[PDB]
């Protein structure tokens, strides 16, 4: 979609891999504002609404928090202290055609400035002066919608760079979806620390003859002592026991 008809889809109840984007070796404006790329991995933020639009190459920098201009003022206004990142990459080989690609339009003229997070899709024409325009072209109507021309031989600045925007914010809604945490290798029969999905502890592993139902995660036996875990990665049972300790 174009900048004047940018969509907003909600991303939730899923797992997002932010490590693959870092080593894509294809982006051109991979910049993060108000957040580090490292800190979003261990912890995440819900409300991962994504915005997609086409921005001309020379005006990519205009799309940033605290940065004013033409596109950032009338087409897509970002709120102050925006906690998100912008990723942009070239689309010369696919988002172009001979003779001019007259399919991407944008809103150039607006009576009032656009407030943050507001989409304005309307066919109303601009009013430069005071005489109203009744749909007939005149000296002060100035039809706002204009179409860009993306020829294959255009310059680097005018090339349509493929850019998407991700927004991270915290509302009162709990239960966010977070980036995956790398795993490790297995170790058997060792007093080793572990941090399963929710609980952590230290102990040794041993075989057990009893069986548990398939819809539990962990368990305790006597006096809030956790003594059983079951990782779902392999669908095999390993039971924890505290390792040897005592007074010398």
């Amino acid at each position: 979609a174009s900048v004047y008809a940018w969509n907003r889809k909600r991303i939730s109840n899923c797992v997002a891999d932010y490590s693959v984007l870092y080593n894509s070796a294809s982006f051109s404006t991979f910049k993060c504002y108000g957040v580090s790329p490292t800190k979003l991995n261990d912890l995440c933020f819900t409300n991962v609404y994504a915005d997609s639009f086409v921005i001309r190459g020379d005006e990519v920098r205009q799309i940033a928090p605290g940065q004013t201009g033409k596109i950032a003022d009338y087409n897509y206004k970002l709120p102050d202290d925006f906690t998100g990142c912008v990723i942009a990459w070239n689309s010369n080989n696919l988002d172009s055609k001979v003779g001019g690609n007259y399919n991407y339009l944008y809103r150039l003229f607006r009576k009032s400035n656009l407030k943050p997070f507001e989409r304005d899709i309307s066919t109303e024409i601009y009013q430069a002066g005071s005489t109203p325009c009744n749909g007939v072209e005149g000296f002060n109507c100035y039809f706002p919608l204009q179409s860009y021309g993306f020829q294959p031989t255009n310059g680097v600045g005018y090339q349509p760079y493929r850019v998407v925007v991700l927004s991270f914010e915290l509302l009162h809604a709990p239960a966010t979806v977070c980036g995956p945490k790398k795993s490790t290798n297995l170790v058997k029969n060792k007093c080793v620390n572990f941090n399963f999905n929710g609980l952590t502890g230290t102990g040794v592993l041993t075989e057990s003859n009893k069986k548990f139902l398939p819809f539990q995660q962990f368990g305790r036996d006597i006096a809030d002592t956790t003594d059983a875990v079951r990782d779902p990665q392999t669908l095999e049972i390993l039971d924890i026991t505290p390792c040897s300790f005592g007074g010398v």
Binding site: L108, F109, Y126, A128, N140, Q146, T153, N154, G155, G157
Partner: protein
Amino acid sequence: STIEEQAKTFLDKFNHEAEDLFYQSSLASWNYNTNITEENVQNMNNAGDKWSAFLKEQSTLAQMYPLQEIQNLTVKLQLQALQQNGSSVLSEDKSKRLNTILNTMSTIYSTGKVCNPDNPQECLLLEPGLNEIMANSLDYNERLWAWESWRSEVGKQLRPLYEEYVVLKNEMARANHYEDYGDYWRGDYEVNGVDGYDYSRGQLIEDVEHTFEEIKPLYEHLHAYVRAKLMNAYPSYISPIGCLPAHLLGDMWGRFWTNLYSLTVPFGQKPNIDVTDAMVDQAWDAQRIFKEAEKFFVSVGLPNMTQGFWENSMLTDPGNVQKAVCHPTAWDLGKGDFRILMCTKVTMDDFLTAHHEMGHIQYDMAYAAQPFLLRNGANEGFHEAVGEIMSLSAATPKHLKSIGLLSPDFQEDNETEINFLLKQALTIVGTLPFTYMLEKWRWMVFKGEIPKDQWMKKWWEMKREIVGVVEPVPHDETYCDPASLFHVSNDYSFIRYYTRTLYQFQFQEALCQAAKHEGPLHKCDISNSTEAGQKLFNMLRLGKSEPWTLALENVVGAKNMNVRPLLNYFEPLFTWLKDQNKNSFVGWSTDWSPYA
């Protein structure tokens, strides 16, 4: 509810609409100069007609904006250029004589004919036929035949056409509230609306005439020296007491004296600086021509070329069927698209032309951030003079020895520099009086204070004064020889070449002073100096948004058109010429004294 906010709305609408239509017309014109077909002529005329009709609609809409309340100067200059009515003032019966006449002249000028009457053996075009007979032969009889082979077969059919052209186009200026059509071309240098910074249209004539009294004493000694080294090939055919023939001055019109270097070499005993044979032994390709040029600009500080030029332009002569013309022109397609159109050759001139035409590209992207109506030079002389200051630096012996083309042990005596400097003097100083006089002749026929019977008596009386030629036979009024030149016929302002020299040497002294070079200007270099980049780049980014008179104060600190930093370049040449002319009669009036 103000006109000031209404103009910014219209110019924002026009900037996006025009740059889409201008790119389509420029791309069609680019394909005509690379791949000539029958349909490509129609393809160029289709896009060029709708681009010219687009300006007709935008000029009428901008007329209703009053100009008496716009205090902003960036939009005032845009509205002055957009509101030029041009052909809209003329009637429908009068507008049809423009496109008919201008296209008949171009097709007529493209017909090359040097076949002698009553002996039709063969004759070639201009490039293969006319240039070899003027640059190599040393025969007086056939060159005299060649003068009447062009001045009696093409200009004879222009006498009823060109005289009708100069009496009705001059009347359009009063309908556009100008003085005359000569005054219309002075509107590019016209600055209005600023208190104390205004530059009158008539001030350019006074300042140009004041600077002409120091060009003349340099040109008196140049003509006296060249007449002694020309009589060696013609012993008893020219007397060394008068002036020179017109058909022995390099070109048909005598504009460039480049072909007299072989005849009038100062000291030909030592070998010249020529490495044309050296590059063909090691197989130097055209990839290498642009690679060393790109790293030259980024070492100065200018931005390098974009990635949309190397895979888009052509470099060698492609195919066998593509007979497209590769006349040296600079292309500004817009929207970040920049191309170079030339036929490469392993020669002295094409290597320097490769440097000369790239400088206009580096100027074109400098004002890329400006709006489309201001995406141009400060005047018509800036965009040509910027592309020639780097040609002077690349031709220096210091730069040739810097890369390693010349031998590491090449001494630099007196005679190794005067031979190179006199080649530049013949192509720069010698063309200044010829360029100003022709535009002065064009001014009087455009003002209209010249009757029909006084065309020739004023044109001929300056040829007797400046050039110095007595007519060997009287000629009547039916000839129309002044309209035969290429620039006057194709509607090109020739005043941009007189101001080109005085700009390309004002900037040369300013950048050399910035680089703190210890020595004269001929040995000066621009490279390896980031201090010089800020001097050029501060004036390049202005474009037409600032007045040109502020651009001079940005480099030299003198608001007027200075002529002093041009004689300082030729002080080594002038002092030698003063000693060589100890006994010769320097400075001729009109002279029938010896052979009355």
